[PDB]
Write a protein that binds this ligand. Structure first.
Ligand SMILES: N=C(N)NC(=O)Cn1c(-c2ccccc2)ccc1-c1ccc(NC(=O)c2cccc(Br)c2)cc1
Length: 360
């Protein structure tokens, strides 16, 4: 069964091997992109990298990739090689690999990963949708079911977790698995039908929550909310946590806030419930997150403003077991075996609630 439990370890990475003989690398698990991209030239921040010349099973595709973004970029050439996940399914797959030769502001100092595993769909793959993403190759080439699960655990008092490919490990979650449909197969896009802060509805038009789009992204730390929703959220959090106040550099995710050891007044901060569209249009279900999740360890406010829609990143995925059921075009949520909570409140997955349009 699961040689896959605790296979995850500044982001969550899994161990993979590339080439022949196998070249061990640490690879970020990223549900918000679709390239399998690995460092393949020396970098100050890289202590190891993919060396194509050492791979007997490397094939050049004679094609480059260029990926600029607001801050830096990555460039490399495209090839294919044999790819395994030692603590995953016992298979080897020929997958596309973007060998990164030049980059800036891509690799992180001390992160411990040398590449990225894009688990989203072909539509958003570089340079275009013809470059089959890794998981697409995996399913087609092997008998692994078109599904994977993510249990991100965080710190608690270095991060750990499990990535279960081709199935659902029932020992990883508690209670009920609730599914929200994948709206479109590009990012893992979903629809948020309502949000409340401490049971208090933001009462905004449904479309504001998905203003542009809403995605589930393991490669983002924060819960990122569209401008209008962010401002409403922080106003509601500031009010609930009014008894003794913080600098506004804290609310913008710049400044940290410290108490000592265990005095931390968690119950001063409110819970956040995200209601996601159910499989029955009319039906919905909530995902409730504690301050233990949106205040990440001294703590930083891990909710930030977005200009590209809602991003449900790591801080909301932690404490939930998240199933990426590509086969049935849906994403399941269940309370995780590892969720961090106090003796008064718990992360929750509850439903149904009956509630639209909402899609932007
Ligand atoms: N939006 C995503 N989910 N993923 C990306 O944008 C992937 N990506 C790309 C990229 C852009 C387009 C296509 C293919 C790749 C460039 C730089 C990153 C890139 C690389 C690493 C990280 N994340 C982290 O380093 C990280 C740091 C702390 C916590 C966590 Br969780 C992640 C984010 C983006």
């Amino acid at each position: 069964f699961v040689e896959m439990v605790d296979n995850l370890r500044q982001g969550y990475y899994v161990e993979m091997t590339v080439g022949s003989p196998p070249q061990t690398l640490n690879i970020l698990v990223d549900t918000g992109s679709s390239n399998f991209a690995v460092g393949a030239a020396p970098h100050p921040f890289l202590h190891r990298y993919y060396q194509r010349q050492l791979s007997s099973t490397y094939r050049d595709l004679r094609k480059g990739v260029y990926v600029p973004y607001t801050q830096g970029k990555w460039e490399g050439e495209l090839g294919t090689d044999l790819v395994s996940i030692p603590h995953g399914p016992n298979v080897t797959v020929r997958a596309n690999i973007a060998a990164i030769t030049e980059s800036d502001k891509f690799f992180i100092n001390g992160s411990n990963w040398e590449g990225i595993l894009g688990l989203a769909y072909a539509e958003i793959a570089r340079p275009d949708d013809s470059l089959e993403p890794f998981f697409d190759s995996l399913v087609k080439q092997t008998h692994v079911p078109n599904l994977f699960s993510l249990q991100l655990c965080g710190a608690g008092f270095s991060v750990g977790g499990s990535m279960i490919i081709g199935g659902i490990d029932h020992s990883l979650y508690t209670g009920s698995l609730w599914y929200t449909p994948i709206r479109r197969e590009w990012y893992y896009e979903v629809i948020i039908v309502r949000v409340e802060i401490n049971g208090q509805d933001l009462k905004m038009d449904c479309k504001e929550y998905n203003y542009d789009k809403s995605i589930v992204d393991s490669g983002t730390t924060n819960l990122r909310l569209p401008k209008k929703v962010f401002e409403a959220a922080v106003k509601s959090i500031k009010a609930a946590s009014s008894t003794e106040k913080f600098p506004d550099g804290f609310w913008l995710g710049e400044q940290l806030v410290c108490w000592q050891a265990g005095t931390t007044p968690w119950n001063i901060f409110p819970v956040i419930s995200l209601y996601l569209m159910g499989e029955v249009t009319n039906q919905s279900f909530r995902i409730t997150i504690l301050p233990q999740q949106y205040l990440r360890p001294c703590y930083k406010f891990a909710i930030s403003q977005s200009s590209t829609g809602t991003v449900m990143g790591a801080v909301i995925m932690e404490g939930f077991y998240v199933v990426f059921d590509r086969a049935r075009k849906r994403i399941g949520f269940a309370v995780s075996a590892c969720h961090v909570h106090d003796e008064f409140r718990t992360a929750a997955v509850e439903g149904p609630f009956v509630t639209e349009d909402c899609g932007y």
